[PDB]
Design an enzyme around this catalytic site. Structure first.
Site, mmCIF file in Angstrom:
data_model
loop_
_atom_site.group_PDB
_atom_site.id
_atom_site.type_symbol
_atom_site.label_atom_id
_atom_site.label_comp_id
_atom_site.label_asym_id
_atom_site.label_seq_id
_atom_site.Cartn_x
_atom_site.Cartn_y
_atom_site.Cartn_z
ATOM 1 N N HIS A 20 0.798 -1.266 0.000
ATOM 2 C CA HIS A 20 0.000 0.000 0.000
ATOM 3 C C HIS A 20 0.817 1.296 0.000
ATOM 4 C CE1 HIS A 20 0.198 -0.301 4.539
ATOM 5 N NE2 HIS A 20 0.291 1.086 4.360
ATOM 6 N N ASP B 152 0.048 -7.852 1.627
ATOM 7 C CA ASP B 152 0.547 -6.453 1.718
ATOM 8 C C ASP B 152 2.059 -6.361 1.835
ATOM 9 O OD1 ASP B 152 0.561 -3.647 1.803
ATOM 10 O OD2 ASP B 152 -0.529 -3.469 3.688
ATOM 11 N N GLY C 226 2.255 6.764 8.807
ATOM 12 C CA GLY C 226 3.676 7.058 8.703
ATOM 13 C C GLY C 226 4.616 5.839 8.830
ATOM 14 N N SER D 166 3.799 2.553 8.167
ATOM 15 C CA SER D 166 3.470 1.595 7.101
ATOM 16 C C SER D 166 4.699 1.111 6.339
ATOM 17 C CB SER D 166 2.247 1.401 6.597
ATOM 18 N N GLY D 167 4.888 -0.181 6.219
ATOM 19 C CA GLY D 167 6.044 -0.717 5.470
ATOM 20 C C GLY D 167 7.308 -0.916 6.269
#
Ligand SMILES: [Ca+2]
Lengths: 223, 58
Positions: free
Chosen positions: A40, A84, A175, A177-178
């Site tokens: 995402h 994801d 912020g 994410s990942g």
């Protein structure tokens, strides 16, 4: 990261910032040319920043490298959030030293109540807004599948886990994410999604990295 | 103009920090907001110009 602490400079050396003009997402350095992040977070014109602490000022250990390639998992479902995961190849190979180092993929899956480190530059308010300059860290245990699935009915797939505190106050947020969930030096998770941040009974949801290891290595080798 | 242009901006459950535009019918302009990177609603534009061409006039 809500309810965490300042990690201290360059002490999570595999943490990267994804930049599109501003910090939009986190990631993990898996070798000198590959980063893993969330599907995402996929954008064009990514620059990866390595060796960050204060993402707002250049402190001199940085390496800024552009992505050549971004490969989102062929089965990523943008409705259900399943798979994801995404890999980013650097235009050129980073240099690896003590401020910038990669993280090992796991050999097995982590169990409920393993304690992990989640790190990131995301919002530090549960309700409110406050993005830090420096990197923040949080120790949070892996939760049981059964309690994950009771937190989010009919939304957890075999590729997600939950980590955190049913009491709320400690979580990862917008912020983050990942970025990594690292549990006994191995990369177990990727910050993915939640119902808000640091809400009671709604722990954060992470990509389960141990399922993808064969996909990562073969995708790294053939690109 | 259209009715989705009156809806409040939706960050969603994903945890990126991505800056997007939404039509603010109260101000009569396009503003920025943080989009978490999944499950966008329709009041969600990648530039102020897209936002203005779609909504401006709602
Ligand atoms: Ca810096």
């Amino acid at each position: 990261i809500v309810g965490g602490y300042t990690c201290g400079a360059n002490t999570v050396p595999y943490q990267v910032s994804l930049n599109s003009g501003y910090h939009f997402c986190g990631g993990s350095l898996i070798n000198s040319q590959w980063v893993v992040s969330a599907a995402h977070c996929y954008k064009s014109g990514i620059q990866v920043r390595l060796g960050e602490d204060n993402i707002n000022v250049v402190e001199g250990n940085e390496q800024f490298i552009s992505a050549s390639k971004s490969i989102v998992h062929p089965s990523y479902n943008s409705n259900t959030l399943n798979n994801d995961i995404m890999l980013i190849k650097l235009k050129s190979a980073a240099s690896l030293n003590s401020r910038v180092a990669s993280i090992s993929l796991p050999t097995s899956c982590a169990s409920a109540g393993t304690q992990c480190l989640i790190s990131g530059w995301g919002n530090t308010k549960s309700s409110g807004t406050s993005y830090p300059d420096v990197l923040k860290c949080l120790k949070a245990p892996i939760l049981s599948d059964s309690s994950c699935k009771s937190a989010y009915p009919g939304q957890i797939t075999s590729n997600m886990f939950c980590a955190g505190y049913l009491e709320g106050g400690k979580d990862s947020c917008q912020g983050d994410s990942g970025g990594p969930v690292v549990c006994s030096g191995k990369l177990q998770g990727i910050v993915s999604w939640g119902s808000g941040c640091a809400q009671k009974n709604k722990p954060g949801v992470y990509t389960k990295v141990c399922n993808y290891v064969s996909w990562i290595k073969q995708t790294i080798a053939s690109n | 103009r259209p009715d989705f242009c009156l809806e409040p901006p939706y960050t969603g459950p994903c945890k990126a920090r991505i800056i997007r535009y939404f039509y603010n019918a109260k101000a009569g302009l396009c503003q920025t907001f943080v989009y978490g990177g999944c499950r966008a609603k329709r009041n969600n534009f990648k530039s102020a110009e897209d936002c203005m061409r779609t909504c401006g006039g709602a």
